[PDB]
Structure 1
Amino acid sequence: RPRFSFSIAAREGKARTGTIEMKRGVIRTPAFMPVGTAATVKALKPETVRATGADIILGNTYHLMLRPGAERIAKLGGLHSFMGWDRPILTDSGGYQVMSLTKQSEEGVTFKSHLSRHMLSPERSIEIQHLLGSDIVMAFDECTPYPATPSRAASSMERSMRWAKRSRDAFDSRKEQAENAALFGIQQGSVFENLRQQSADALAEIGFDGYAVGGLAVGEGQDEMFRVLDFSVPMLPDDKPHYLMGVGKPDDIVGAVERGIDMFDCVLPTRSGRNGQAFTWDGPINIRNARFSEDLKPLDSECHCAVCQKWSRAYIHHLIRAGEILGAMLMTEHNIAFYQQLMQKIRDSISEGRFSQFAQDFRARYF
């Protein structure tokens, strides 16, 4: 098993399907990464997350450094052993969970524990990811508040590129980390093509194992996001994975893949699942609606997840309205399973050169 090897097996338009081989496992792309912010994919045992088809999950530097603590997790043997997930884990750098969920400077960011004072710099971010034992380390960046003026978008992108270099050097100077994990850079620049180009060029000059498109999924509509992806993704190195941070709505994913994206993550499947929203091939439904109180059909008519094989909408409706934990468990497993099935259909259609048709058929029925 190599430290990192991304191979593209098939293409159609800007879409690609392939694999990323890492020491802890293989990642099938396009891939969807369930979110496990507090060292757990909410309401699911790791074996269940794996059973749905997930090859990798997402962790968070910000949340884990606060609770239970980076040093503590290292003392306990690492995040993998801690939570019981032995496959790849990608960790965000914290560059967004601090300004989202605080004194900023060219050195990093200091903040008040939303739950104490804590400092987070490019060097400390990379070190925390090392202590967690992350497989895919994200460069520490400074996200840009949306909407953003050209001047502000430029300043934030420029700082992010300086921090990208500091992240690269911190990562490379740590032997154990450089030889066993991978480092992804993050493109910034808001919705401005020239800034995106400058960012892409700076990142490519430094060199990374993968390139994320940051600054999206922060309030912009799908039209705008797609517009930015149209010119932004082609700027990134073609032979490396393209990761769209925070994008998860089913239709968003299909459109992003049509534009060259290989990796995704979103709290939608889990967060919405707990809120009563279930994804189906015919569009999302809210199981709390009274019309489901005596509906004996499964969440989705085609889904092959364990939830749809055993329980009815009526039962889950009852569980969610009653505030039962099993309701959260079932809704979450189904939603994550749905997302993985979507990724599988995407991968197979690209491999067979019928992805454009799949996208059309998907949209027609989903909407």
Structure 2
Amino acid sequence: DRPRFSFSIAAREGKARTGTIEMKRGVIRTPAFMPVGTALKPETVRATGADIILGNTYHLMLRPGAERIAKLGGLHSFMGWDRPILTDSGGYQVMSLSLTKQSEEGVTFKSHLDGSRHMLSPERSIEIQHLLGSDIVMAFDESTPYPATPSRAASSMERSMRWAKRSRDAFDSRKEQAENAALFGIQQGSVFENLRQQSADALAEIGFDGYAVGGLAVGEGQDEMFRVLDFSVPMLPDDKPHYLMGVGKPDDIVGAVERGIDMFDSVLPTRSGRNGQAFTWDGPINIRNARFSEDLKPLDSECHCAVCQKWSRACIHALIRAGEILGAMLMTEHNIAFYQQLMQKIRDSISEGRFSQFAQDFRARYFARNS
């Protein structure tokens, strides 16, 4: 009988950890990369190694709507994915894509599709994520645009913490949700150490199944992101998963695991694949470049994915140049699989106590760009 949510750390190296999250719909190996599910077939996404995928609540609210998804059987039935699904709260896309009114109560916003009015709040976000039936639920917070003044960073963080308690109570009010799903809280505080500590203390007092580091990957650059992670991750409870939302490039992931992060999500592998960019151990490549037109090697000569067992750079180049959808599908499958192989090498190297070496070896090769 599988548990609701059980995080076990199997091995450590410095701040890095590797282990598992056991949930009713399956086991998640950590550090984990979650592709964004909101197209490749779900069996293809699973075969790349993904243990869990992410759904964007905001987009699902606008089309086809969470009530419709619930009537269809829930998000797992809707997406054809029967393993765990994490949903975000919707709040970030409200800031970035939609906004009629904002207050401590919640937000009202207009659909950028058809102009209809929608509402989000801690209580409404948790309820919508319940209708979607997701396994990991994100608390609803307030995002502050980058760069943020110290005043606005403190203001949004304190509101986010009040909203985190409201998210906690809303989640706990539904027995069907509280017994079967998990709830993560989100640390805020921009680049400010005292605000991050304030946030971490408040979240740990409320209590969550996992803790996200919010407010990064919004324009700040890698060096600054790493500096914030340096002091922010140790503030979170050690025995629970640490989730860096919206990150990121392969070298961002490696450096964040060095700093204690267990979970990641990013649209980058799928966006790059649609745009003709492949990730490789020698850095990203643009497959349209003429140098690939007669290159019989696969996208990456070490990649274990199904695409690289069969297709050459030359032939993917031909498909992409012709605008054939198969080209984009193959690139996208490869990129998601490459990300999963990166996570597997990270997990194995932590287990063997050679992750610090792997990270240095990885960077030297990825940035040399000898592709």
TM-score clears 0.5: yes
1:189-244 CA-to-partner distances (Å, cap 9, x unmatched) read 00000000000000000000000000001111000000000000000000000000
1:111 is paired with a residue whose SS is: strand
TM (normalized to structure 2)?
0.96
**CA apart distance, 1:139:** 0.1
CA contact (8 A) 2:99 2:110 kept: no
1:22-52 CA-to-partner distances (Å, cap 9, x unmatched) read 000000000000001xxxxxx3111011101
**CA apart distance, 1:297:** 1.1
CA contact (8 A) 2:99 2:107 kept: no
In the other structure, the counterpart of 2:183 is 183
**CA apart distance, 1:292:** 1.1
CA distance in 2, matches of 1:152, 1:235: 21
**CA apart distance, 1:144:** 1.2
**Structure 1 stretches of 5 or more lacking a match?**
37-42
CA distance in 1, matches of 2:268, 2:300: 17
CA distance in 2, matches of 1:294, 1:354: 37
2:179 is paired with a residue whose SS is: helix
Q: Does 1:355 align with 2:351?
A: no
**CA apart distance, 1:341:** 0.2
CA distance in 2, matches of 1:102, 1:44: 35
CA distance in 2, matches of 1:59, 1:304: 27
CA distance in 1, matches of 2:66, 2:296: 46
1:184 is paired with a residue whose SS is: strand
1:189 is paired with a residue whose SS is: coil
1:93-143 CA-to-partner distances (Å, cap 9, x unmatched) read 011011079421111111111111111111110001000000000000111
Q: How many residues in Structure 1 have an aligned counterpart in Structure 2?
A: 361
**CA apart distance, 1:256:** 0.2
CA contact (8 A) 2:99 2:109 kept: no
CA distance in 2, matches of 1:291, 1:90: 40
**CA apart distance, 1:322:** 1.8
In the other structure, the counterpart of 1:39 is none
CA distance in 2, matches of 1:358, 1:143: 34
In the other structure, the counterpart of 1:18 is 19
Structure 1 ranges of 4+ moved more than 3 A: none
TM (normalized to structure 1)?
0.97
More deviation, 310-319/160-169: 310-319
More deviation, 313-322/49-58: 313-322
2:49 is paired with a residue whose SS is: coil
Distance 1:22 1:101, change over 3 A: farther
CA distance in 1, matches of 2:331, 2:99: 25
In the other structure, the counterpart of 1:146 is 146
CA distance in 2, matches of 1:108, 1:324: 44
**Structure 2 stretches of 5 or more lacking a match?**
none
1:5 is paired with a residue whose SS is: strand
**CA apart distance, 1:314:** 1.2
CA distance in 1, matches of 2:333, 2:359: 24
CA contact (8 A) 2:44 2:333 kept: yes
In the other structure, the counterpart of 1:196 is 196
CA distance in 2, matches of 1:272, 1:222: 19
CA distance in 2, matches of 1:289, 1:105: 50
CA contact (8 A) 2:184 2:212 kept: yes
**CA apart distance, 1:304:** 1.0
CA distance in 2, matches of 1:73, 1:290: 45
2:208 is paired with a residue whose SS is: coil
1:134-181 CA-to-partner distances (Å, cap 9, x unmatched) read 000000011110000000000000110010000000000001000000
1:313-355 CA-to-partner distances (Å, cap 9, x unmatched) read 1111121122211011100000000000000000000000000
In the other structure, the counterpart of 1:261 is 261
Matches within 5 A, 1:1-367: 1-36=2-37, 43-99=39-95, 102-115=100-113, 116-367=116-367
CA distance in 2, matches of 1:289, 1:67: 37
CA distance in 2, matches of 1:94, 1:81: 20
1:349 is paired with a residue whose SS is: helix
CA distance in 1, matches of 2:220, 2:327: 31
Alignment root-mean-square deviation, CA: 0.9
1:46-71 CA-to-partner distances (Å, cap 9, x unmatched) read 10111010000000110101111000
Identity %: 99
CA distance in 2, matches of 1:125, 1:331: 34
CA contact (8 A) 2:190 2:216 kept: yes
